[PDB]
Amino acid sequence: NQYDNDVTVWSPQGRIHQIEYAMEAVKQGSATVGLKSKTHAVLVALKRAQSELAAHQKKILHVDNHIGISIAGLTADARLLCNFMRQECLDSRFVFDRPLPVSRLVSLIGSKTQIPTQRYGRRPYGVGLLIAGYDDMGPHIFQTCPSANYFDCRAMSIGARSQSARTYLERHMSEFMECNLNELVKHGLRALRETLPAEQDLTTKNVSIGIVGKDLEFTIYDDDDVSPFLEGLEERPQ
Amino acid sequence: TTTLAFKFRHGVIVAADSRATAGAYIASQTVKKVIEINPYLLGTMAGGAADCSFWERLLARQCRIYELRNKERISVAAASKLLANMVYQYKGMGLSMGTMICGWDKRGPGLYYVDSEGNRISGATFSVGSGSVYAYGVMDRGYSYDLEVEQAYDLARRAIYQATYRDAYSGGAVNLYHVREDGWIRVSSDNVADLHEKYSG
Amino acid sequence: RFSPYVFNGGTILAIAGEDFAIVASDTRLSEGFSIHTRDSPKCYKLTDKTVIGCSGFHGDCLTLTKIIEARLKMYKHSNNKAMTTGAIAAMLSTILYSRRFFPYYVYNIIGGLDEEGKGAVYSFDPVGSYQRDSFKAGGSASAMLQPLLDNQVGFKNMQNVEHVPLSLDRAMRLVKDVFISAAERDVYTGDALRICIVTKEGIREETVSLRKD
Amino acid sequence: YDRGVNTFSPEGRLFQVEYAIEAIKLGSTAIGIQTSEGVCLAVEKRITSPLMEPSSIEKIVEIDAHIGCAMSGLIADAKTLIDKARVETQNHWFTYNETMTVESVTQAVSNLALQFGEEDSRPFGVALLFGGVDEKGPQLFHMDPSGTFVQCDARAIGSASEGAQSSLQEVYHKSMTLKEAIKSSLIILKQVMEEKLNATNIELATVQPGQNFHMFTKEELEEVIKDI
Amino acid sequence: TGYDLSASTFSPDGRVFQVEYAMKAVENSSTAIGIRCKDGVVFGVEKLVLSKLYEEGSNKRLFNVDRHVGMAVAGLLADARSLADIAREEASNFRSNFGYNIPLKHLADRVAMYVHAYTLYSAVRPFGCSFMLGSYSVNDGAQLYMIDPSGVSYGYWGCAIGKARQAAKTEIEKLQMKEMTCRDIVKEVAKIIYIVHDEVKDKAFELELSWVGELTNGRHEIVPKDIREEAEKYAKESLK
Amino acid sequence: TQNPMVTGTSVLGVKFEGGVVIAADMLGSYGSLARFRNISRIMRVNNSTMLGASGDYADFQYLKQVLGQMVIDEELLGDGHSYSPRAIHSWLTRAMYSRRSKMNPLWNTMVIGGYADGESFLGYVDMLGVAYEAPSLATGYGAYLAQPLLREVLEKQPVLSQTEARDLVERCMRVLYYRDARSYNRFQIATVTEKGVEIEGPLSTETNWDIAHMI
Amino acid sequence: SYDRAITVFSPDGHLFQVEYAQEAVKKGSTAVGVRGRDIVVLGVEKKSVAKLQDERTVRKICALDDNVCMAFAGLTADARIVINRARVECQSHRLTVEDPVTVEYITRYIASLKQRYTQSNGRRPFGISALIVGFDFDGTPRLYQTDPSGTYHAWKANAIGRGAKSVREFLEKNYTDEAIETDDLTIKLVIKALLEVVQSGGKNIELAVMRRDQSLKILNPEEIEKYVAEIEKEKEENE
């Protein structure tokens, strides 16, 4: 059990346990769900609070005019990768005078997170990125991991008790591709309402929805353009 | 461009014109030259706009930091010293800057004169700019220490009128600031043609 | 030898009204005794309430435009709000002094609304001072345009002429007439006119041609 | 085990930030309440000696003309972060002619609340309360050593903060007034402090939108205490 | 054993266990083979979907380093991504300083030295990757190389990296490797990948094939596998 | 570069309906000596855009090297995204501007012609970073000489065909052969449509000298 | 957890090496410092002559400026370094803003130096604690103290080093507002503190004053003998 100390050490089974511990550090964030149609990508997260009187820690943060990320886990590394993200976006915006393709940005994220998982003196980033964007070939829903093994999907959900969300995404990923924004967003919160224990319901002030569209700029929403999204639901089949 | 400043019994009088040309062409008529650093310090704009504006804004920053660290106002000589030490680090690289620092002290009145050449000096009266010599003349006619308030106002107003009258590079609105013990207050902003109609007879 | 600068010229006007800031410019981009194009608008829409004009050396105009756009996005994406007009003015002044010892050969004029909803024209200089004035003309046609604005906007040197506030349509026809009258005698002016109007309802534009020589 | 910052737990977590949240608790208490009329703020000094000069111990310091502060625990980082944030406000004012809003202030602070690193130092040991008046009226913010920064309506820090939060949630609502909130705060203070409440124990800090300058009460504090 | 914390330390019998433990980290990784015909090299990777969440077209282990060189990695994916970036950088330096396409021997030697330098020092770990390198040249023919986690880099006709490292090359060597053009070798790689592990420990895998040689005129790309659809109509005829 | 050694000469480029044609000649003059009378002065970038330059030929080789590297990099990403011609224009402008800002200018005068996604593109980059779009570009002395022909016909007719544009390019190059001392009677035409990039061979001109029989 | 190193917190939320570094200060020589109305006064005990050397080098009370004074506890070498740095800082401030250095500024400097010196990488924090006594602003007497942590903390009277609990415990039931200084009462208060010392050997008392306008006065142990005699006179008058 002494091999389970530092990033540098290979295990005698080859499984570097710092990466697994970083994964479990990701698993203690808030629940969040990301999913795309052919034309619109929506990612919806969950807010949490320290007490009743306090405000709620926001999860969706804006990045760029067509790029928006979700998050889970640590907030310091979240804002650090936010700063790097915005930096790369405005750098390519300055040089090439174009919006970035999303895939090369996420490859840059992987190459950014590779070095702190290889040398000594820096920890891996406990991070829960769900990236939505628009290159020329439409919407994208990528996810990262603290092991930098970035994926592409069509409906992902990471965080705490995210598995029932994944089963819901499995049994409706055929249904997803055809619909417009409204019932897409309500499918997203029809994942979130099973990311919760059943004795309390998703209210206004605890949820956050971010849409990016092929002609629509990336926009965050909270409670007020979310009361149009929260109506149109039934109860859970109790 | 012609500024002047003199201190007396009831504080410090600061006046200047408002004409800032560009070569042989006048850019503007209402360039506010007396750069307000604080509610207790007043700086001027004497030769070059960018250097005066930038470095006095930086000095205002430094004064605010000094106050928030010591819970207490800075003195005038301190600020003049800091400005000279900041300006000195680009000597020979082509900065033109001849500003003045006015303010009320724990000692009372304070009047220093900071150059881009570094001529940080105290004094009683000063005058900077191209038509500054005209102001020197009429001011050192009218100068005393026991002057009244309206009397010093009329002195400064007459002085800037003569200055803008004989020099080509001066005119526009006549700013006139007055430093007190408690804080500075603008006196008036008067046009030259109004002064000509008023004092010509 | 290598010269770092070339005079491209151009004409920028700005009028701060009661609730509107009209900025207009021609689109002729020339060099020496040649014409490179007849469409290059000097106006740039920063926000819904701020339009900047940039004349002089054209490459520095492009570079400065892009840097200002970058820092706009930085402030917004950091602080959840757009800049004011004077905030952008102060930022531009800091930048122009930040390259003091290799100057931009660029005149700049920012119009836009204040936080009261009133016009505010912030002039500039190539080194980085500024002021809130009612009207400025930048570029080669500055001397051809300032005294007429003194006659009309400033109402100066006149007798028994009362002061009417500058309305919108009056200002528009004034801008058209000053650009015709300045294009007749200047060599760095013509071929179009890009008029930008900043109201409380967005940014309108309007294109008026000129004489083709 | 857990021995430094570059190592996680199996289940979570570090275990250095956790020890920072532990190290907050030794300090003195403080209570700030946001009211739409303005932000009130209170602290306890824990004065030891009569030779201990009371106005020399700082808890409420001044950042801007409308941005106050309160500190906790370790005095050291509570001086360091103040000396940074003052400069930050001045850089913002310098390049922008305006007042850096309180949320943006705390973003500037928490951009290096956790930049802790000895290579490529230790995490800081202070929780801070930030009050100020932006364009959106009054603001009250609560940060932590971990940078996990949020807005709070009425936050209580440091020692005895559990019952402080409980009895604070008993009294608070959204439509408070000012003077009610002031006396409501010092009631909670003299239910969590140990000594007698007097002119030298506590110090208030009230910033109003029309009374931005001087966010402070001096020896009218005596009159406010004697009204209970 | 014990004696195995630092990557800089030796053992009392003389080997470095960090190198060893990193070598057998790729043992659990997916099966990736490669075989060259007389006028080209064909890659093939047994690639697996996790459950239902993927998009059939993400995280492709068939990289593409240069215009005529691409990788077929196996092991830790992100480390392979970084190694691919290093190789792209090295090829770009060679193109910029000498004006022509990199010869594969020199490229493999530079990359192997880079891997070796990561095996040396104590601050860093050895790589957890094992990858394939294929090329084609009109003046050189076809070259197929191979890089272990340690950095021992030499050449093959065929190779296999993954679980079935022996279990593929038991029947890779019974191929008539020389006398075939690569369009036969496509369905050969198909049947080889399709033989190992259809349903036993896992559920579903999926086939990618990279493809270089004379037929692409020196280009390196993935096949249009769906064109001529060579696997499945032959894979279902290889179950009997 | 302070002193340009080996200059090219004027480069002509003009849009038409769904394409852009560029043609520059093949002369490598040094001083006044036409030392290199067979060189190529147009790079065929990947599939849409296309570059033509004047000035120092070595700097053009350097930019050829760097852009070929960049295009090969993006193609080896395999993501299906290429550079727009306008992105190329932007990058080249930024590169030239940063190069002159360090007082070591690249002595060049470049034209970027590209056709991408229905819209033609025709861009200009100067040594000082002066850059713009135009329906017709002429570099060097061509801006003095053949530019009025382009601006005459484009004022006479705002759109063109490929045939009309090619003929107009031929006539302008003939004119440049008449009264440019740094001209040569061997030029190559480059053309981009949506069918790709195509470089024509070293064409020549047909001259007239019947005025010489007058005194 | 454990006392090594400086960086890592305790499992119950403490820094050990700062807390252990104060024991060095507590295990050193004793020195008090008081401010009167116009005269400020301090002095170290335990001169501790060893009969075979001079003591003019071992001086624990020095000055940085002509307005400020020093005093310390803990080990001597750190005090030497901190004082030699503080002099340079005082002159560098004088080269700036032309005021005499305010005592608050030099205490902020020393505490900040020690603080960023504490946070850093494996560096041994200074095991001293200074007394910084000066009257600058309109002759207002001030005296501040430091800590190995680096938290300056303004007092009206002070006691550090050995037995400092009792040495300060004397100061409450002696220190009145009344009156005032009255420099003789300030001196007699210093004499009561020196007689209140842990040993009060009679000859090992070395006290130095400043009357807020002059320079430092080093006293003479015949005047102090008359002071001890008149203290004994008042003690006999108590009977």
Each domain of chain G, given as residue ranges in start order, spans 1-239
Kindly state the DSSP code that residue F213 receives in the 8-state scheme: G
* C-alpha–C-alpha distance, residues D155 and D30, integer Å: 9
CB G7 within 8 A of CB G107: no
D193: phi > 0 → left, psi -120 to 50 → alpha, else beta; which? beta
* C-alpha–C-alpha distance, residues D63 and D87, integer Å: 9
How far is residue C150 CA from its own chain's centroid? 17
* C-alpha–C-alpha distance, residues A8 and D146, integer Å: 26
Phi, psi angle pair for D38, to nearest 5°:
155, 165
Q: Which residues of F touch E66 (CB under 8 A)?
A: 76
Kindly state the DSSP code that residue E3 receives in the 8-state scheme: S
Phi, psi angle pair for A4, to nearest 5°:
-95, 60
Q: Which residues of A touch C72 (CB under 8 A)?
A: none
- The token duo for E2 is 């014990």
CATH code: domain of residue A72: 3.60.20.10
- The token duo for F54 is 């004047």
Q: Which domain holds residue A66?
A: 1-238
What lies within 8 Å, CB to CB, of A72 at 6+ separation is A26, A29, A30, A32, A59, A127, A128, A158, A159
Please tell me if residue B102 touches chain G, with a CB cutoff of 8 Å. no
- The token duo for G182 is 């009255």
Residue whose C-alpha is closest to residue C116's, from C203, C14, C20, C52: C20
Kindly state the DSSP code that residue B114 receives in the 8-state scheme: -
Phi, psi angle pair for C212, to nearest 5°:
-95, 10
* C-alpha–C-alpha distance, residues D32 and B196, integer Å: 61
Strand partners, A202: none
* C-alpha–C-alpha distance, residues E128 and D73, integer Å: 46
CATH code: domain of residue C158: 3.60.20.10
Question: How far, in Å, are B5, D47, E148 from residue B76 at the CA level?
Answer: 15, 37, 73
Beta-carbon contacts below 8 Å between A and C: 13
Phi, psi angle pair for G52, to nearest 5°:
-120, 15
* C-alpha–C-alpha distance, residues B171 and B157, integer Å: 12
Q: How many CB atoms lie within 10 A of CB G133?
A: 28
Nearest CA in chain B to C143: B25
Strand positions, DSSP E, chain E = 32-37, 40-48, 70-75, 129-134, 144-147, 153-155, 158-161, 205-208, 210-213, 220-222
Q: Which of residues 114-143 of A touch F (CB under 8 A)?
A: 135-137
Give ∠ CA E125-E127-E129 in degrees, rounded to 5: 160
Strand partners, B14: B5, B177
* C-alpha–C-alpha distance, residues F87 and F79, integer Å: 17
**Cα dihedral across residues F138, F141, F144, F146: positive or negative:** negative
Strand partners, A154: none
- The token duo for G229 is 């005699």
- Please report which residue ranges of E132-200 form alpha helices under DSSP H: 165-172, 182-195
For residue D81, the SS3 value is helix
How far is residue F9 CA from its own chain's centroid? 10
Phi, psi angle pair for E162, to nearest 5°:
145, -155
Is B5 marked as a binding-site residue?
no
Letter for the amino acid at F117?
D
What lies within 8 Å, CB to CB, of C98 at 6+ separation is none
Please tell me if residue A50 touches chain D, with a CB cutoff of 8 Å. yes
Q: Count of domains in chain C? A: 1
Q: Which of A62, A94, A97 sits opposite C77 (nearest CB)?
A: A62
Q: Which residues of C touch B48 (CB under 8 A)?
A: 127
* Domains annotated on chain B, with CATH: 1-201 (3.60.20.10)
CB D186 within 8 A of CB D228: yes
Task: Give the length of chain E.
Answer: 240
* C-alpha–C-alpha distance, residues F118 and F194, integer Å: 8
- The token duo for B41 is 């310090």
Residue whose C-alpha is closest to residue C27's, from C188, C202, C203, C167: C188
Letter for the amino acid at B2?
T
Strand partners, F111: F52, F124
Give ∠ CA D105-D84-A48 in degrees, rounded to 5: 40
Residue whose C-alpha is closest to residue D127's, from D206, D204, D29: D29
Phi, psi angle pair for E195, to nearest 5°:
-70, -45
Strand positions, DSSP E, chain B = 2-8, 11-16, 20-22, 25-28, 41-43, 100-104, 109-113, 125-129, 174-179, 185-190
Best of A94, A95, A218, A222 to substitute, by most chain C Cβ atoms within 10 angstroms, is A94
* C-alpha–C-alpha distance, residues D89 and D84, integer Å: 9
Q: In which residue are the tokens 């005294």 written?
A: C147
* C-alpha–C-alpha distance, residues F177 and F158, integer Å: 26
What lies within 8 Å, CB to CB, of D48 at 6+ separation is none
- The token duo for A221 is 């929403």
Strand partners, B178: B13, B185
- The token duo for A6 is 């530092």
Please tell me if residue C128 touches chain B, with a CB cutoff of 8 Å. yes
* C-alpha–C-alpha distance, residues E172 and B16, integer Å: 95
Angle formed by the axes of helices B76-88 and B49-70, to 10°?
A: 130
Residue whose C-alpha is closest to residue C189's, from C4, C12, C3: C12
Q: Residue F171 class from Cβ within 10 Å (0-12 exposed, 13-18 middle, 19+ buried)?
A: middle
Question: How far, in Å, are E194, E225, F148 from residue E233 at the CA level?
Answer: 12, 12, 66
> Method of determination?
cryo-EM
Question: How far, in Å, are B76, B96, B119, D98, E225 from residue B115 at the CA level?
Answer: 15, 8, 5, 30, 79
Best of F64, F76, F79 to substitute, by most chain E Cβ atoms within 10 angstroms, is F76
For residue A135, the SS3 value is strand
* C-alpha–C-alpha distance, residues A107 and A98, integer Å: 18
- Quickly list DSSP for chain C: ---S------EEEEEE-SS-EEEEE---EEETTEEEES----EEE-SSSEEEEEEESHHHHHHHHHHHHHHHHHHHHHHSS---HHHHHHHHHHHHHHTTTS---EEEEEEEB-SSS-B-EEE--SSS--EEESEEEEETTSTTTHHHHHHHTS-TT-SS-------HHHHHHHHHHHHHHHHHH-SS--S--EEEEEETTEEEEEE------
CB A39 within 8 A of CB A214: yes
* Domains annotated on chain F, with CATH: 1-215 (3.60.20.10)
Q: How many CB atoms lie within 10 A of CB F129?
A: 23
CB E83 within 8 A of CB E128: no
Residue whose C-alpha is closest to residue F124's, from C37, C57, C55: C37
Q: In which residue are the tokens 């003789």 written?
A: G184
What lies within 8 Å, CB to CB, of B24 at 6+ separation is none
* C-alpha–C-alpha distance, residues A16 and E75, integer Å: 13
What lies within 8 Å, CB to CB, of G133 at 6+ separation is G33, G35, G40, G42, G68, G69, G71, G103, G141, G142, G143, G210
* C-alpha–C-alpha distance, residues G39 and G216, integer Å: 11
Q: Do the Cβ atoms of B65 and D94 come within 8 Å?
A: no
Angstroms from C54 CA to nearest CA on chain A: 18
**Cα dihedral across residues C5, C6, C7, C11: positive or negative:** negative
What lies within 8 Å, CB to CB, of E186 at 6+ separation is E42, E209, E211, E223, E230
- The token duo for E121 is 């020092």
Residue whose C-alpha is closest to residue E125's, from E162, E84, E79: E79
Strand positions, DSSP E, chain F = 11-16, 19-25, 42-43, 49-55, 108-116, 119-125, 131-133, 136-138, 187-193, 196-203
For residue D146, the SS3 value is coil
Kindly state the DSSP code that residue D68 receives in the 8-state scheme: B
* C-alpha–C-alpha distance, residues E122 and E10, integer Å: 12
CB G153 within 8 A of CB D56: yes
For residue F67, the SS3 value is helix
For residue A187, the SS3 value is helix
Residue whose C-alpha is closest to residue C203's, from C111, C92, C89, C87: C111
* C-alpha–C-alpha distance, residues C140 and C107, integer Å: 10
- The token duo for F89 is 């224009």
Letter for the amino acid at E182?
C
Q: Residue A49 class from Cβ within 10 Å (0-12 exposed, 13-18 middle, 19+ buried)?
A: middle
Q: Which of D6, D117, D152 sits opposite A53 (nearest CB)?
A: D152
Q: Do the Cβ atoms of B50 and C128 come within 8 Å?
A: yes
* C-alpha–C-alpha distance, residues G186 and G133, integer Å: 15
CB G98 within 8 A of CB B77: yes
Residue whose C-alpha is closest to residue A72's, from A112, A107, A38, A30: A30
How far is residue A117 CA from its own chain's centroid? 21
Residue whose C-alpha is closest to residue B120's, from B72, B166, B153, B82: B82
Please tell me if residue C127 touches chain B, with a CB cutoff of 8 Å. yes
How far is residue A57 CA from its own chain's centroid? 15
Q: How many CB atoms lie within 10 A of CB C143?
A: 12
Q: How far apart are the first and last CA of chain G?
A: 57
* C-alpha–C-alpha distance, residues D172 and A126, integer Å: 36
Strand partners, B22: B25
Counting Cα atoms < 13 Å in the Cβ hemisphere of D2 gives 16
Q: Which of F69, F76, F78 sits opposite E96 (nearest CB)?
A: F69
CB D131 within 8 A of CB D68: yes
- The token duo for E111 is 């990359």
Q: Given this structure, which CATH class describes domain E1-240?
A: alpha beta
Strand partners, E220: E212
Residue whose C-alpha is closest to residue A59's, from A189, A183, A206: A206
Full 3-state SS string of chain G? CCCCCCCCCCCCCCCHHHHHHHHHHHCCCCEEEEECCCCEEEEECCCCCCCCCCCCCCCCCCCCCCCEECCCCECHHHHHHHHHHHHHHHHHHHHCCCCCCCHHHHHHHHHHHHHHHHCCCCCCCCCECCEEEEECHHHCEEEEECCCCCCCEEECEEEECCCHHHHHHHHHCCCCCCCCCCHHHHHHHHHHHHHCCCCCCCCCCEEEEECCCCCCEECCCCHHHHHHHHHHHHHHHHC
CATH classification code of G1-239: 3.60.20.10
CB C192 within 8 A of CB C39: yes
For residue D78, the SS3 value is helix
How are strands ordered across the β-sheet holding B174-179? B125-129, B2-8, B11-16, B174-179, B185-190
Beta-carbon contacts below 8 Å between A and E: 85
Q: Which of A2, A16, A119 sits opposite E123 (nearest CB)?
A: A119
Question: How far, in Å, are D28, D203, D206, D223, G125 from residue D218 at the CA level?
Answer: 20, 8, 11, 10, 38
**CATH-assigned architecture of domain D1-228:** 4-Layer Sandwich (3.60)
- Resolution given for this structure, in angstroms: 3.5
Please tell me if residue A103 touches chain F, with a CB cutoff of 8 Å. yes
Q: Count of domains in chain A? A: 1
Q: Residue E156 class from Cβ within 10 Å (0-12 exposed, 13-18 middle, 19+ buried)?
A: middle
Letter for the amino acid at G171?
L
Q: Which domain holds residue C118?
A: 1-213
Task: Give the length of chain A.
Answer: 238
Give ∠ CA C68-C69-C70 in degrees, rounded to 5: 90
- The token duo for D195 is 């000594």
Residue whose C-alpha is closest to residue C35's, from F129, F158, F123, F151: F151
Q: Which residues of F touch A137 (CB under 8 A)?
A: 80-81
Q: In which residue are the tokens 């103290």 written?
A: G145
Q: Do the Cβ atoms of B70 and G105 come within 8 Å?
A: yes
Residue whose C-alpha is closest to residue D122's, from G110, A73, G17, A21: G17
Kindly state the DSSP code that residue D122 receives in the 8-state scheme: P
- The token duo for B62 is 């430094």
